Ligand binder design. Structure first.
Ligand SMILES: [Cl-]
Ligand SMILES: [Cl-]
Ligand SMILES: [Cl-]
Lengths: 114, 112, 114
């Protein structure tokens, strides 16, 4: 799957190993190898919830088919605390959205060429 | 509603108070209280279109639940975007998306 | 057409005239004039991909028209080398996905309203 984190928290505040930690956590929850897991953390964003520019994060999880619904709740219970504590963000200012990816959409590896 | 602005304008020249201003404008346009509004501005992008790397902004509004609506939204937001970010109006675009109720945003306050 | 490049490569590491070059390559690839090409490079992301935080580029091309394998292949042949060489990324860490744009999704220009 692909986990994306948009946040207004400064780049320097993102702890070292946080990417590896997210990857390991997703790999733990899914039983899927770290090899096919992708994670994007985008800091230094200009964001506001309700006009408030306090530390916050809008996150999106993209997986094949639909390992969600209740697994959405599961994923939330798995990721929310980690995000909130690592990024110094209040839990009520972290949002996670879940999307279904199209399995038939083929990603092209450039090593076949170039 | 969530409003996203992708721009190649440097973060420093994004006016202080622009997020609040955008929030209130969206509150008027959508008719929803600011608490339900999220604004996401992405500066310092490398962007080009129309054969030019001049200042520009590609924006998107995502909300739960029409062309007329999109038009009125554009009328309400365009001037603010163009003037505040110092971008020529013809280099500001806005797309509108109806958000699928399955699924919306899950807040983490309930969980850990 | 709209080409998006998500990369962990620093913004300062992106060579002068890269957007112009990409625009020309994309216009040759899509057979549309350069003026119709849109390019969005999103650098300085914190990306782990395949369990690695080494330089990488996850790209997407959005264009109106049916998604075809041969066309995607030709696109990749045209784009991969340019991306890898210009951004100094290993070709096996550059990926391109191809998406069919919804023609009924109208982009509103603000010159009409400002
Ligand atoms: Cl502000
Ligand atoms: Cl009409
Ligand atoms: Cl070919």
């Amino acid at each position: 799957p692909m986990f994306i984190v948009n946040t207004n928290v400064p780049r320097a505040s993102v702890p070292d190993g946080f990417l590896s930690e997210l990857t390991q956590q997703l790999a733990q929850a899914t039983g899927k190898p770290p090899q096919y897991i992708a994670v994007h953390v985008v800091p230094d964003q200009l964001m506001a919830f309700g006009g408030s520019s306090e530390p916050c994060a809008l996150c999106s999880l993209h997986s094949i088919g639909k390992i969600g619904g209740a697994q959405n709740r599961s994923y939330s219970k798995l990721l929310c605390g980690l995000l909130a504590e690592r990024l110094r963000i209040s839990p009520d200012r972290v949002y996670i959205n879940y999307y279904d990816m199209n399995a038939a959409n083929v990603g092209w590896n450039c090593s076949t060429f170039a």
